[PDB]
Design a protein around this ligand. Sequence first.
Ligand code: SF4
Lengths: 76, 87
Amino acid sequence: QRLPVLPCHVGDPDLWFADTPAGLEVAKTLCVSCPIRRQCLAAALQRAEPWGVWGGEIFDQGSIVSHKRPRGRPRK
Amino acid sequence: DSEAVVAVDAVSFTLLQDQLQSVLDTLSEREAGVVRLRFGLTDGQPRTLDEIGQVYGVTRERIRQIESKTMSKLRHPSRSQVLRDYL
Ligand code: SF4
């Protein structure tokens, strides 16, 4: 079916929870071409997923952050 | 005999156990042990939250947070498709 075209499970699944701001960036933008962004993002927002890339967007424990804040002192 | 072995549910159950063993083995060791002891996939005996916390040397809130994160990781479609077809 359309399973190998689905960009979620094409490669290694441990990529999409890597705890670097730059590592998961290609994981987030790899769901640009995903055919099911609407329903996946809708399910992720309704069930309140606390981790990882969902619907081509990252998640905190309840909501969506724009980009994950890096380790260290943030920029003034 | 409406209560016999249907001869395809047994092989389907064996393949389900094989696939679940695979997906549980593609995780971290502490999270996999926490999931196995939480749902009783080791020996058919489910373990309590404080029991898992006692045998792994952390607190119960840490244990349940690790369990919630691991449940999210398994609920992710990248690990979840091959089991999504079974149910
Ligand atoms: S997170 Fe995005 S890319 Fe991954 S399966 Fe869901 S919609 Fe597709």
